[PDB]
Amino acid sequence: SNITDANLDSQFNPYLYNKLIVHLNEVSADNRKSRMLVKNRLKTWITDETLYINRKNMKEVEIKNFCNFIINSNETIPVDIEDSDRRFNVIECNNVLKEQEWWTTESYQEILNNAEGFAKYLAGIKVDRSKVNEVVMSEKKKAIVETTESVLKQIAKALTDRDIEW
Amino acid sequence: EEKDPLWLYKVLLTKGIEVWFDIKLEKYGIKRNNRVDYIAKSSLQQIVFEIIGKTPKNIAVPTYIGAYEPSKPEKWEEEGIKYINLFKPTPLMKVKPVKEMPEIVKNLLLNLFDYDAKSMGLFINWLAFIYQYKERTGVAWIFMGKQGTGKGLLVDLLKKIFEEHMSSNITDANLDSQFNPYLYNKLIVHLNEVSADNRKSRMLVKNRLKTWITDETLYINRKNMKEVEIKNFCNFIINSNETIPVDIEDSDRRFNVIECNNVLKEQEWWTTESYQEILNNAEGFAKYLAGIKVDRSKVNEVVMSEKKKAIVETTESVLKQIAKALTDRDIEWFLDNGLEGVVEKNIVNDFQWEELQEAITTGVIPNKYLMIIVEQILGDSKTITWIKRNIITPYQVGETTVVKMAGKPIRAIVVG
Amino acid sequence: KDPLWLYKVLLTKGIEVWFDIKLEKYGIKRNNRVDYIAKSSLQQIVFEIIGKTPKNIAVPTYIGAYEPSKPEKWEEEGIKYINLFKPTPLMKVKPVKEMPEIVKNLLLNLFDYDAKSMGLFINWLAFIYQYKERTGVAWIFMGKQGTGKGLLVDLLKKIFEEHMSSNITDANLDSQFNPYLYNKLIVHLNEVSADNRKSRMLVKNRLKTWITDETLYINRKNMKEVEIKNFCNFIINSNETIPVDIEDSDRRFNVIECNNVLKEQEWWTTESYQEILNNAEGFAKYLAGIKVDRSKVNEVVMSEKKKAIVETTESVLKQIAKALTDRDIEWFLDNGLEGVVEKNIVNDFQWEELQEAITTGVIPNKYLMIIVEQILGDSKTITWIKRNIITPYQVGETTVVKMAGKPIRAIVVG
Ligand SMILES: [Hg+2]
Ligand SMILES: [Hg+2]
Ligand SMILES: [Hg+2]
């Protein structure tokens, strides 16, 4: 829980050792150079079959990677995303919980007291293994792609596609 | 005192465990099922106690030097120095050849190579040489283009064949370490990007990557172990999604560059199970590689593909391109790069325009036209000093001197 | 009774073991490999050979020193030394008067059939082969790829073996460790740094001292940092336009540029490469028979490519400062100063007085500013010119001079 750029800049890798879910609270700062310095390392954490784990006063070890990543962010562009990207689904909500019909003072704790109920629900899902690795080009992901990619690539592809409308 | 200094070695061999002391690492080697670990004396005493029930104060095992040599026996002697081999074939390298590839694996390589049979075959030949001869080739293959073309799948599938002899998914992070375990006793090294997507990062790594591909030996430094020199058996496969993954010189001998934009999901033959079918045909692909008739002349062959040409011309200096255009009196290169704009801006009249072109073609360029030419190509005015220091002198285009044209003495650069 | 009983017994089996007080490790030498190991590691070797682990190690105490001129062991002040230099086979070889024909074709191609510079390199190599000392002069082979630079490296590598470091690059240099310099007669660099202004300058001073320093500080992993005498000689291969920065007065570098591709030659065949490497002993015999001219070992030549590197590398401000100092009007005209006339910054009379200021070494401030602006391409103030050209290079003094009637401010060169 709540791994951030600070943990990433450490020389150690505990938060990845023997994990099924890793949650990042921001991957880096919201500037062009921070997103690009971390872009390739996050790319491989999601898909590499193994990871090199290095912990304090322990031998550096290679292990199979079981990690799955959930990234929370309050920034406008949390990560760099390529057009052909296969790894990221992007969900943007602007529905503040406090501002909802059903939200109460006890609501937060009721949500956490229904972990077992939610766990029972997931245990009964008929998992479609075809859709597990499906990613969607949402309108916010499309916005991140066109913000992130090089303008020179956008010009080059407009010429290539003879895209006068572009 | 002891009658047989090899008694413990012998007893462990009966039970399928080979133990020695490696003078070069000052650690104890232990081999079981062709996996070898190097452990301290205290850890070896613990292993021994579990097996024979006694902890011997003295370790009755031979002293060998560990050497990774695929061509040599399990143990051998050179001069008076006894060696033990650290290379052990994996299951899928000891496999009966077949003449044809699994159909789905061939659809993947055909997708990667965009149905170009020539370059696919050259890569198969390169792979087949590594599988059968187990030597360093001095040639690396770069697979680039958009995501989802199957680059990682091919890596995963070779990784099931080679196993421990291959390093998977090495990144800039591993390279920025002071350690290089990913190079120790490896036949294939796979890199996911070599550096950041900018000019200076590519250049800082250019010579490091160049020597990893061709050095006969490497200095290996691993955590908590002596720094050791070893023979280099690495061959490099580089995956990248960037436009220019590495710097490449024109005369390059090391890089083959393959670009696919065929996304697997967008293909007629792709199914949901296809991904898992590809990985379950590792043995099928290995049997295919085992039967390839390797053409050893072509193993170190590199081709100048069009994407390779694009990287080279993006990589080299604009100043060197101008210098070679002067040297070759290549008026066509200058007009290809827009030198005719000089007339459209009336910097030069049509008579002067004739002398400017002819100055280039004859290799005798008056200073006034030199500056005009350079300003038009580079977009800002350069002094003669700047043109001499950055184009004429470093590339030895010619000499700056006084020449006589009709009567007048004129300052010019004479190409030669 | 005999504190050397184990030493003697290990010699029987072809193993020489000593304790190195300077490294506080145990040396063990077999067949020109020397390893330095811990006491527990030597006890393990000893147990396998003699069947007992002795609590006390009956070995001599020596200091390990790499000295090619000295015997296997020697004494100085009663301090016993052991030699870490041990000749390779191809250094123990019978001289001959001529080199193998195909090896001479390789060197002829590298040196573009220039017998003068080729011979100076052979003499340089022969001195290293025969005397095994540091020369203080490095050789840079540059030009197109495929001229045979690596082939010459590979062939000396067979000759020198362990006393040579092959294919050291900027990556090794940025390491905190220094193995490639420990106990070496030849070190070969494949590029010293990237081909940019800042990379060449950051490494310029470290390469300067490696060639000429009498000692080096060697630091290896899990070993004490040690000072040793430096026997290194450097061969630098490069495909870059400017491989290193070179000063005008430089004394260390010879620069050889060949553009003769081996594949494109009359005599090159498919077997040629391996024939070249199979004539190591022939080339070694040739060097063994050279009458080395010790006067020329440290001679460097100002080749046209080295001259090109010098003028590319050095500061333009130094070039201007020395042109003023030498009143070198021709230098200024070669660098386009007459553009001042064609742009009407100066009329025909002033143009004469400006040139006259340069040859006379008395330059009015007004003409100083014009000259500097035309050469550098941007307008400079008098203060900037004094702080960045006149003062740091001691071109001259700013003073009032009388020119025609008027008292005028000028820089007097001297
Ligand atoms: Hg993980
Ligand atoms: Hg390697
Ligand atoms: Hg040295």
Numbering used by the authors:
A (entry chain B): 470 to 635
B (entry chain A): 303 to 718
C (entry chain B): 305 to 718
Sentences from the paper on this structure:
NrS-1 polymerase is a multidomain enzyme and is one key component of the phage replisome. The N-terminal Prim/Pol and HBD domains are responsible for DNA polymerization and de novo primer synthesis activities of NrS-1 polymerase. Here, we report two crystal structures, showing that NrS-1 CTR adopts one unique hexameric ring-shaped conformation. Although the central helicase domain of NrS-1 CTR shares structural similarity with the superfamily III helicases, the folds of the Head and Tail domains are completely novel.
